[model samples]
Target: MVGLIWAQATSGVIGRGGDIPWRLPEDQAHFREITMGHTIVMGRRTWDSLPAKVRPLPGRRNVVLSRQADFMASGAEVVGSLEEALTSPETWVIGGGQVYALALPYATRCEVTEVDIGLPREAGDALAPVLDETWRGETGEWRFSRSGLRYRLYSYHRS
Candidate 1:
């Protein structure tokens, strides 16, 4: 099974690389708990953005997808193609838009942090693709707040 996780704000906006404006303690805790021991796949940009202390999240195997052969991370395996990442029975497709788009076709589950906020017109970056209703199976939603901004957590699975 492939799991995809993302968080969106009250204005219906997710993130532009590093800006996560909502508080997600519960989401983070839940992710750590569920994803522990699972393999995670992400794009080179996403891998590079991780803080030194958090890179290669503990208890999970990290697989970085890149077109370049030189990408490297300690304790993480770097592969140049998506075909290599999908061999695992269970995996999480962590993001940075291009990676998500590339992995969506093979994902069996999606754990999204849906926010109610809208993106600023100038937030020039990638956006999560609109999920097709026909592909969604089970779904759950939760409401939360951080720094006074409201947000929702959504999880979806393919039927």
Candidate 2:
């Protein structure tokens, strides 16, 4: 199954300073549960932002897309073009912004977490490409949070 995964804030903010702004353990668990054992693809920046101890997400095939011919990731397969990345019949486009936008056209399913909070621009906020509601199909939600920051995991399939 071709897919994508990312968490978004209520305001549709996805990232800041090349990293996720929130520290929701619930979402962290959810991400691991969903993508483990899958062939996951990500942009070079996303690969760089990962915690050093957990750099190459265990149990998943890590594939990175990079423009630099010399780019190297310790435990990942670095490919130059989307065409090369798409060679896998089953792949998950894990993000930054541009990579997600580029992969959307080929992703049939997306797992997104909607957090009920927003971060200020001063903290460094970046948005994901807006997906049309009309393309979404039915999938229920599960709520999770520990503080004022509540979140819901929404499984959306492209119609």
Candidate 3:
């Protein structure tokens, strides 16, 4: 199954300036737990967004999607297209906007954290398109909440 995993603000903002807009250690932990032992696909910016110390997320096979034919990734596989990254039977598409959008329709399921922050146009937000009715958060479950932030982990199934 192809899975798409990400956290996005209420206004459908996922990132700003190559980083996630907020910091929540709990949310980070949630991400790590869900993606553990899985193969993951991401856009080049998402790869760059990782801390230098953890360039390739451990415990998972990292495949980076980039247009550059010669992109050099120290510990990950480089592929020109998303399909090339999904050779594994189960791969998580962890993203920047472009990667998420490309994988959304094809995703068998999506694990999303709906965060509380919304960005203004002046904030230079990276977009996460609104998921349509065809996608259902009908089995919504509480995921995590902590000081200064509250978010839900939603399972969206494509209908």
Candidate 4:
């Protein structure tokens, strides 16, 4: 069950600076609902981007990939590389560009929330992985968030 999950703008922007640029509660709720009870793998930067109180991301096994010897993510398993992280059978490659890129090839499924906004390339430091022709995408109806952003859910499987 190797999967990848993320939210990104139409331009493929996932993060600005080190955090998500948009605030969409529904998107957050959707994320929680989908990833709950699954093993989630993220890069150290992604772990750091989470709020302090939810560092471990309740109800799921958190695995952080980092090369920094001194990096310690309390309550999360720290793996030195993607190969080590992929040893787990049921895992979701969660976020931060580098981690997503590393895990993309192994991912059998992908859950993406595509926001309507498109930002300039410079506005975002982190980008989403490109799902090529080998993947089949099924997108849901577009919905408006409380923040006035339009977003749609996309579930993709490797063909």
State TM-scores per candidate: 0.84, 0.88, 0.90, 0.93
Q: Candidate 2: minimum summed lDDT over ten consecutive residues — where?
A: 118-127
Residue 74's lDDT in candidate 2: 91
Root-mean-square deviation of every model: 2.3, 2.1, 1.9, 1.5
Model 4 lDDT at residue 19: 80
Q: Give candidate 1 regions above 4 Å deviation.
A: 10-12, 121-123, 137-141
Cα lDDT of model 2 by residue, 1-159, tens digit: 678888888777888877777878888888888888888999998889887798798998899999999899999999997768776567888797879898888888888888877554454566666778755755446565776577787777866
Candidate 3, residue 123: lDDT: 58
Worst 10 residues of 1 by lDDT: 8-17
Each prediction's number of clashing residue pairs:
14, 0, 0, 0
Name model 2 segments beyond 4 Å from true.
120-124, 139-142
Name the best candidate (by lDDT). Answer: 4
Question: Model 3 clash pairs?
Answer: none
- Candidate 3 matches the true fold with a TM-score of 0.90
lDDT of each: 0.72, 0.81, 0.82, 0.88
lDDT of 1 by residue, 52-99 (tens): 888779889889998989877777999988878876678888776788
lDDT of 3 by residue, 1-159 (tens): 898888888777888888776877777888899889989898998888888799888999999999999998889999998878887778999888899998887887888887876555445677775677788675455555665786777787775
Better of 2 and 3 by lDDT: 3
